Design a protein around this ligand. Sequence first.
Ligand SMILES: NC(=O)c1ncn([C@@H]2O[C@H](COP(=O)(O)O)[C@@H](O)[C@H]2O)c1/N=C/N[C@@H]1O[C@H](COP(=O)(O)O)[C@@H](O)[C@H]1O
Length: 232
Amino acid sequence: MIIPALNLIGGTVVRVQRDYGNDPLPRLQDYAAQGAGVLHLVDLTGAKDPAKRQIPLIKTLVAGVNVPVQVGGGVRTEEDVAALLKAGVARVVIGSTAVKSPDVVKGWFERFGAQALVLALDVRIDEHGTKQVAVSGWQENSGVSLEQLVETYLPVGLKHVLCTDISAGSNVSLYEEVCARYPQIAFQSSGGIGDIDDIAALRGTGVRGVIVGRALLEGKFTVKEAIQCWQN
Ligand SMILES: NC(=O)c1ncn([C@@H]2O[C@H](COP(=O)(O)O)[C@@H](O)[C@H]2O)c1/N=C/N[C@@H]1O[C@H](COP(=O)(O)O)[C@@H](O)[C@H]1O
């Protein structure tokens, strides 16, 4: 599936910065109108300040579409997850916290269920060829590999994993490897999509979701054409 994405800062759509206007709902509705089944939102305001979590806006955007929306952005506490889900969010995307407190997040899986949580992994292939997990782009590796963290959450029923290469299209070999090793996990690719050929390159990798952000905002292609290429 194609997963259109938007980055939000105080109700503003931004390139990750560059402004794209403060009217995200018509964009999302048109995305869904072209056949999109899932949408993706990153709350950068809430990621910076937890008390600034754009819950009312998210609640409006969710109510404005007919498709499940997965939302992430500095999700730190069990209360953050509950608040987002209560706002109508389908799945909560968790990156940093899932790396720093695995035992706590594993408790979240037990309470909320694996259908409501998405494990986001920022991955850098280091000097040794290890798929290192990082909490952000401006910080060093954490000393934990993708395999270690994935197999840590498998006992609590891990299903959805968002994998971003932060070390030009998407890293095809990367996704081919991880999707084959963990066939019981629906992997989502993220970052790298520059044109329509980048989507075609991921068709046989085994990924179940392709997240596209910029390419849509810059008119490289439409969601419709993306889905057409994806379904071949
Ligand atoms: N400062 C940030 O930019 C940031 N901070 C966190 N995230 C993501 O949020 C999620 C949760 O992060 P935490 O706040 O829990 O650590 C993870 O997936 C992170 O990668 C961030 N990523 C934002 N942009 C995303 O990166 C990808 C780029 O795609 P492209 O346009 O097609 O090229 C898309 O998925 C975009 O939505």
